[PDB]
Amino acid sequence: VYSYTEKKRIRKDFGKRPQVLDVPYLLSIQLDSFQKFIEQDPEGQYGLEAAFRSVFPIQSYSGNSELQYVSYRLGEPVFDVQECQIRGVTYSAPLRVKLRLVIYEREAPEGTVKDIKEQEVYMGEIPLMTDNGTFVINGTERVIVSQLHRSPGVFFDSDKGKTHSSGKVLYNARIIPYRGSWLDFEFDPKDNLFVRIDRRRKLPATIILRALNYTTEQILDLFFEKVIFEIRDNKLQMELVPERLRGETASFDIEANGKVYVEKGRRITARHIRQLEKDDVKLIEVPVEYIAGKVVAKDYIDESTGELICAANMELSLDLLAKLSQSGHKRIETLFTNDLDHGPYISETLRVDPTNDRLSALVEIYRMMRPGEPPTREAAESLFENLFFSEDRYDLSAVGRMKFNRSLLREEIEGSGILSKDDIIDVMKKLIDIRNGKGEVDDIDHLGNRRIRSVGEMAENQFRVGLVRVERAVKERLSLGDLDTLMPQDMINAKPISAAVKEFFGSSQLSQFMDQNNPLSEITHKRRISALGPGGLTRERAGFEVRDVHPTHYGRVCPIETPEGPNIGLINSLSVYAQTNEYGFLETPYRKVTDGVVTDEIHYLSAIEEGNYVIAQANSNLDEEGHFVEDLVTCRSKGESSLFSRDQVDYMDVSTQQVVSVGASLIPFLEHDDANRALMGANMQRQAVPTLRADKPLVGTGMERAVAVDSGVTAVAKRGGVVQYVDASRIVIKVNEDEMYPGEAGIDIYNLTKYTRSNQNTCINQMPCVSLGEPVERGDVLADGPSTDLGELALGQNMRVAFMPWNGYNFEDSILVSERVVQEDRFTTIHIQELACVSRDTKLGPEEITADIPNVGEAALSKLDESGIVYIGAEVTGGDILVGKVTPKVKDSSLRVPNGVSGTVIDVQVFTRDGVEKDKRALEIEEMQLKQAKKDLSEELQILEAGLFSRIRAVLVAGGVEAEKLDKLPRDRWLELGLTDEEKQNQLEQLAEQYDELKHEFEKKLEAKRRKITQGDDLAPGVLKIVKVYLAVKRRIQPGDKMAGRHGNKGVISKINPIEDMPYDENGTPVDIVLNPLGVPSRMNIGQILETHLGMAAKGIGDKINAMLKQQQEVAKLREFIQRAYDLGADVRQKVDLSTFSDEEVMRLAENLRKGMPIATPVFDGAKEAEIKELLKLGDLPTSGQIRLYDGRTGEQFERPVTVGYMYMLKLNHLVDDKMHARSTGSYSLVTQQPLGGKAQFGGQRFGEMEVWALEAYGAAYTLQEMLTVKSDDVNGRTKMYKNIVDGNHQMEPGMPESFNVLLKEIRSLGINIELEDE
Amino acid sequence: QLTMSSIQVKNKGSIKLSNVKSVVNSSGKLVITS
Amino acid sequence: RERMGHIELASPTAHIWFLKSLPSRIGLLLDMPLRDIERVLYFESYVVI
């Protein structure tokens, strides 16, 4: 069933796989992350509440005084988004926190409070996220990019040889807290454990164990299994468990019940061991010298002499063992040791370990932490306690503890945030047994080891940093301040918190200037995941492995959309259905397969759990009952793909677009494109500039509507109703009676954005797509945004294209464009630039903005007003004065139009400092703003009054009908007349009460709005006045501009061909664009061909419908043909029944389809070639997609058929107008007299090292010399060269370059005598 | 453009040997001692 | 941009280039180890001139 609005233009869908899970809200990550940050959390797990609870209470050094946090609240922002953008201020809310100052009684028993002060304190401004996941910082729209970082926890790694000798792998373990120092253990080439705290000098690991109050005997017990030698009389017989002796050769003739089983020289095998199941021999005699290679595991003394015979971890020698035995010791402790699986790493580290007790270990650790500073016992103990065992300085987060326990196979997810002795011991044990070949190292690039921090988490972290900065000051203010009667506001200072928050939101690497070329660019920016930033990677240093597509990226990270160049593999795009779990790990949805039936139950699996299941591929055929029709389905099991039976299968992919991102999901026939060109096309879709008229893609994927709606660039109906009013700037919806709340007018007003510049100086314009009286439903698009057509993303234009060479004008990706494309303004775009004229204070006097400018004629000042500011609507060109300003010396400092920037003045804004007389232009602009504001509080009032009047009319004729009093008694009398109350007006007392409140709401804030309009807005220090002029320019398509499709097929226009010269078909229709076939084969982006064919088919359908519209055919014939068109396909999922439509709806649909029927071809469930040929037949077009073309220049037939179709082309934001630049002479740099750099500075081109090498290779010595001297920092040479050129003398007189003198002076400044010699 | 047990003659011609020492063999087929 | 200045130093100061740029020029000339000269230079030890 289709709604009335959907009936306008139904895109034909060739998708065959049924859609089980809807595409989620594409901006969920940002909104949810910030909502976690700012919303009240009673549990205190996350957000501002957690940040406060993690630092509060703060207590004095004595502890007599303290602060207790009670609660927090966010106030109403002073300005909303629009005023913040206009005034260039941050859109933020005030943070108001309820604090309590507890002063405790002196000489009291315990913690008794003498007094409590309850106050509310302002702790700064928290920037607020907008409705579309953006932030307004200093008036600029910014996106906080999510960061992919190593999860906190324990991670076991190794370097596969490639460090020392040959093949020696050194295992290591890293405990990474979310907050605190990093604890590393590693194996050296000598198989000794070493410990590193914060990448400092490595120490023996045993020191840490000593620092944990573990003696040598305790350590050896922890990390070794005790073997016993129990001597009765002699012969050194030894008790053992059989499993111990497996692996090594036989040192003695092992005896079984008095009978020898294996003699010397034969290695013990598995059968040898299994023969002792019924042979439980315990005491076994061994040779005396066999003890030589053994280590004693305990501390021993002689019974009463007091002379310790030995200590733990000592080699047992013949003299040692013998004189031990003569002392009557019945048994001796030893360490079980092997060579391959029970290596004595701990014992050898003990040997190396220079410390001998807890104090020595503490001193060594303090020495390593504090190099060169004297150690103290108390200081060392405090430092070691603070390193990993204090909540204030160390914190494993909840995810950190979870990952820590998971890696150690602990069945408790929840735990403390600080390390314990057991945690460190278990980490050491797992590292040791990984060395022993029992475990496996972790994959660093595995998405189960890399998590996502978003805007909320990072904002909370920066807030906590600011809060601890406040804590340091407040603790000393409470301790060393003889406080009495003081309030908690006195101690609290909001400067550090505000500074930290502004630094994060304006200067962080992940706080990025929003890419706002088109809605797709906004969506992609809001969905990017960055491996860079603090705690991440650097693009100069990242290796191949981290940049690669990892198998766990499936369904979580797009393997296609990533930047080219240095940022490749480091910046990624979230997949369509991907989301983060509670721990920040990316998870993707799957359909549960139960008993061979693919159910509709959806489970979101993370990378760790996904590898434990067999998941069927999305392209797997099912039936009505859900069983797999085939018996060997392709599946992914453990990062590998193979075939399984249906019973083996556990899960299935929810969609064929699950793996790709939004931009990749917008590419039709993506499966026929090479991945490199698909990457290029997905990247360039974001660079498309919105054109004069939004044009739907004839060939789409079906994702256009979702992108357009979720981007927020369109006006979407909050509630259903009927269009009560509509004009190019506003839409007024009369809400349906079933969607209105009690006591409201039920009017929805949508004010449209009109011709505002984007972050990239493109035009943001909303125009309504609904008519007067149209019925609208909730979620309906009311106004199209930029690059949006009837709620569908429309990045470019549909172009009739032929694939053929045309006289070299399509050579090397060049594009030939017909002049009709220029005439029809298909790719003409609006660009809005903001120019600022600032009048300041100078040492001499204030700068004056006036129309009296010296040394200019009256003709040059005709476009200015009396104040000296350009009129609205004035057509200006390069050099024209916009704002006349004179700086005293007076000198001409007036703001002029940049060269070749001819445009129209569409807006002028004046900002005046307080105490400054605003000019008459400012006065009239203020008057216009006041009038518009008065209209805003009246026209909105009038419309809401109309809605309330309609509501009161509806209610009053329901049980209280009074026809006469409708006309003989006016509205106001009802409100107050003295009569007995009844059912007639009691209900009106609740619905006209809101009417009276609008008498108390719109008028009450009128004074506030006037005050805001007339207030002198604060400006930069020394700024008297700012005049902002907005210049709007139409950029028409021209040679040098960059065009591209969605398939990576990019090019630069080489010629604007006249229409009579362009290739044309038998009907005389010329093509719009000629593309080179030669760029198809090697690129292997075959989709652009198929789309072309499909595009033709689409146009063909329109070409029929349009015909039936011009011949005024019956609605029945159009019904039949359109039904045939929608029914075409090989068992497509879409079903469109035109019989349900009315005749008017069918006519409207046919009108919307007469320019071509839109086609939806999903990225991996798209139209087949046979379906495309069927659609070509339906439009009476050749199945090959190739037609006979004629040469416009001569009329001659091209000898072979040419692929002619429709391609959806984009104009990229790489216009030749912005790139063309030239300079003869200009300004120069200060330190070096070389020309400035950059087109914006009118700079010169850099002749770098390689250009100099090329000139040297040519032998062009004079050209090189003139580049080095007279075109550069040779001031005298360049002046003389200019004078000679003006005199017609092309001869240079080179001197010494100034930068060489700068180098000489700089080397002198280093105390080095460098000079030129005599001659 | 850059990245990152027996011998059988295949053609017709005479075979020359350099740095060679020849001595008596069991089968008459020379063994290299050089 | 051509006239230089000078700063009179209360005490002699060791040029960093002739000390730390390996091999140490002061160290090689005086046959002392770099660590020793550094301790003396940055006030951690004495030298029996």
Added chain:
Amino acid sequence: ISAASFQETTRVLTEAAVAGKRDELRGLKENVIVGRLIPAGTGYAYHQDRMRRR
């Protein structure tokens, strides 16, 4: 001058300052740095004259 302009400027300049090295403007890099004609191609003959006069 060439070695300092290539790499390890600190070490090369320390060597040169201690040794008191003298640098003849003989190569291409040296003449490029001082903005002279290179001893190659059309400037080659020029340097020849500069050699013969000296």
Added chain:
Amino acid sequence: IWAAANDRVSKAMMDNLQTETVINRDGQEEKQVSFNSIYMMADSGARGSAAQIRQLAGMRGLMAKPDGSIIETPITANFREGLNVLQYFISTHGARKGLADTALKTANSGYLTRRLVDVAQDLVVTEDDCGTHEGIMMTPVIEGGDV
């Protein structure tokens, strides 16, 4: 086995693509070099190679894991038929590897070029003939059967 199958598919595709059948003036059917557009582009040398044509119309073939090991099951589809989700995801590994390889090797190439330029910057032809009788002996480069 899969490499042999890929070779067979490639041979069949090229044999079918490189020839067309034409009627003579005597009404006989005769074979000739194909006038297929893509075959003409490859045969002329203007654009494309046999390997790319095989990806277009044969099978993409065996792919490699990011670690460099070859995936057991090759991509049996071609760009005309269209890949499935798994095949495309597998191919993204090689695509990303190649692009990252280019991006990171360009810097090493530039550094090597700068070092070579410095080491050879001062060398100039300064004489007509020094008169030396020495020289290097040039012979053909021979490695096994082929020269």
Added chain:
Amino acid sequence: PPDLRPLVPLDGGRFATSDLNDLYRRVINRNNRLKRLLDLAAPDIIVRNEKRMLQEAVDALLDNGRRGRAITGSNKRPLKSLADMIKGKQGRFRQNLLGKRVDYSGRSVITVGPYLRLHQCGLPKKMALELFKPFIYGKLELRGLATTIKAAKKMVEREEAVVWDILDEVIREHPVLLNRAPTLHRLGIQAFEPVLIEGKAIQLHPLVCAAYNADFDGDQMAVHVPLTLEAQLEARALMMSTNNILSPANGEPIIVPSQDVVLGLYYMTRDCVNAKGEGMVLTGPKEAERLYRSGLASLHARVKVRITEYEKDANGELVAKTSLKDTTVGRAILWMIVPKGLPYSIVNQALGKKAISKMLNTCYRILGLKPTVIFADQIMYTGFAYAARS
């Protein structure tokens, strides 16, 4: 000197961190405090602390970060010291001495000019007007159209027709240097004769694109104006594209046709079994061209054509031999552009990229530079035309 360490104004009234004056400030401060704590006298420990921190200030000013931690400014960024002035990629040597920004330079997006000759480039007239501006001033005063510099500047700003005539006169034979980054070898800079074009994009000759590793999917190139007579003659005699047809790395030709030209020559030189006009006998290439253009014969028809070819003798003169060749119509048509002295068999085959490159190399070896340049231009034109017609 202070002018080598200036203070850049920000927002009109305030200065940013110079990052070098801060180190000097610290050294001066520490030196003065040391000297003053040496006059009043103090416990030796604090005197030695002040001496040590003066040492640290001086060694940070000379080489910040070489020994110990790197002193940090307002931001976490390390301070940039005197040693950093002269070392590294951003140091004085590599950033201002071995390479530098130059005047009389511009840059723009490049498009293909298929009509250009090998020695010509398409240059925007706006770009040329900006680049050659002193020459315009000189000529305007030369014919007394502007008495002073100011009048000439105003005339150029107004863009009068006479100023465009001056621009036409100036650049008649004055070459310009085109460069595309990266300049991997010397052919990345080549000299061309500018031809004024109305657009904003530079038109590049197809054949030199391989030399530049350039295409037309967004590439941009820089243009430079040789000022002096020596530079102009170095551009004409050394760096002009006509002199750079061979590769310095291996000696092979580098202006070899590719893509559309190769496809056009291959298509025109292919033969078909029963093409229209097969079995005809033609007086020469002109008759073949007439038959093809009038539609009476296919381009791939196998025919007999009277071909007159020329061969250099021992003396070096061109001896002419005329004979009937079994060839195609397209091969006979292509024969017209072949310079005298080449065997007819060089075109009597389907011509691929290898064959076309061999044709150009043979032309260069036998006949020299000028016939080679003419032949390359003719090959490019013919290839484009017949690729379009195909």
Added chain:
DNA sequence: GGGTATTCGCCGTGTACCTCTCCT
């Protein structure tokens, strides 16, 4: 008293161009 193997600190890591914000 001497030689040799291992450790540690320094050096280096493509060119050209374009846009934005922020910086005592």
Added chain:
RNA sequence: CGGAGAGGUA
């Protein structure tokens, strides 16, 4: 008009 951060083009 210098430095830093972010992004982008070839």
Added chain:
DNA sequence: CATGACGGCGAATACCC
């Protein structure tokens, strides 16, 4: 404080006589 880079090389360090 940052804790995700690594290969090459020379001076110094330690071990082994």
